[PDB]
Design a protein around this ligand. Structure first.
Ligand SMILES: Nc1ccn([C@@H]2O[C@H](COP(=O)(O)OP(=O)(O)OP(=O)(O)O)[C@@H](O)[C@H]2O)c(=O)n1
Ligand SMILES: C[S@@+](CC[C@H](N)C(=O)[O-])C[C@H]1O[C@@H](n2cnc3c(N)ncnc32)[C@H](O)[C@@H]1O
Ligand code: SF4
Ligand SMILES: [Cl-]
Length: 283
């Protein structure tokens, strides 16, 4: 027998966030964060088990820019990872932080579900000109030789939107296009912190969006079948999460990577199918 090799891992180090997206599948269930020593040790355990790429997620990572900055630097300088990535809502990213940590960040991804403010307000992404923020982040990325990535959630409300003029200007190297996903115990009812049900779309509606946009090299479509089990999910206590099966392991800090990963389903075929291995190191 052999355990799977956790080549590319998402560490959701916080569940705290400053926005209220109605579909969110990683909700504010707790404010617990690991101490920096513990986080470093778990990231080291992952590296030692074959991790090559780390994505810092949440929650909103830039609620904790000093902590994030320290783990980013550690991952590149001390663990020598191939790829250090972050996904952010963009609101709290500041230029001087990007300048300070750019040498250690391969990829910075920003979420944008719409270029229409009223749509952002409706979906819970909030008010204000978030397009000028996205453009600003992209500019900071390009100035500081970080690869700029865009993540978009496709829902019942926005699936007819045409983003091509923006894609042709921003030119992200990688553009995730997610079908909105229901996750049991996260966003699946009126009792969870979010109720994503009103956002769901059919395969046909998802294709409306995909067909308009799939000509871009950057375009990466992820229908539900390609998100359900294709990621490695490490939570705020460094436990693995199985979001498809609604399971949670013991912390890697207590039982190690291999024992924890045995408990979760990671569909490597789906991982490969969606292009989960790619040129993730900056050039
Ligand atoms: N069932 C799932 C599937 C994905 N995710 C999370 O959704 C986000 C998707 O962001 P993405 O940019 O696709 O993550 P990366 O791992 O950086 O993607 P890639 O390496 O393919 O660029 C990640 O935080 C991932 O952990 C999740 O919470 N539940
Ligand atoms: C949970 S967020 C965490 C990082 C940051 N707060 C942000 O929104 O970018 C990570 C990614 O998951 C996406 N996402 C959130 N809920 C989702 C859902 N139900 N289905 C699909 N993708 C989702 C987000 O839009 C984002 O691109
Ligand atoms: S998807 Fe929205 S609510 Fe969820 S963590 Fe990101 S910004 Fe916060
Ligand atoms: Cl780029």
């Amino acid at each position: 027998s052999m355990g799977q090799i956790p080549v590319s891992v998402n560490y959701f180090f916080t569940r705290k966030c400053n926005k209220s997206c109605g579909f969110c599948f990683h909700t504010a269930k707790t404010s617990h964060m690991e101490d920096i020593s513990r986080a470093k040790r778990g990231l080291q355990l992952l590296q030692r088990a074959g991790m090559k790429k780390i994505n810092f997620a949440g929650g909103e990572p830039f609620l904790y820019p000093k902590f994030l900055g320290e783990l980013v630097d550690f991952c590149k300088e001390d663990l020598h990872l191939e790829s250090v990535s972050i996904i952010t809502n963009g609101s709290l990213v500041r230029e001087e932080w990007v300048r300070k940590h750019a040498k250690n960040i391969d990829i910075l991804a920003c979420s944008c579900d719409s270029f229409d403010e009223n749509m952002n307000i409706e979906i819970g992404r909030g008010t204000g000109n978030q397009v000028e923020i996205l453009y600003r982040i992209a500019k900071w990325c390009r100035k500081n030789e970080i690869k700029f990535k865009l993540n978009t959630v496709v829902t019942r409300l926005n699936y007819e939107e045409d983003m091509n003029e923006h894609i042709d200007t921003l030119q992200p190297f990688r553009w995730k296009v997610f079908q909105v996903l229901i996750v049991e115990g996260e966003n699946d009812s009126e009792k969870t912190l979010r109720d994503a049900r009103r956002f769901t779309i059919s395969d046909k509606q998802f294709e409306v969006f995909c067909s308009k946009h799939r000509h871009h090299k950057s375009f990466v479509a992820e229908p539900n079948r390609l998100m359900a089990s294709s990621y490695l999910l490490v939570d705020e206590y460094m436990r693995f999460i199985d979001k498809d099966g609604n399971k949670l392991t013991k912390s890697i800090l207590d039982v190690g990577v291999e024992a924890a990963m045995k408990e979760i389903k990671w569909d490597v075929d789906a991982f490969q199918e969606r292009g989960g291995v790619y040129e993730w190191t900056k050039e």
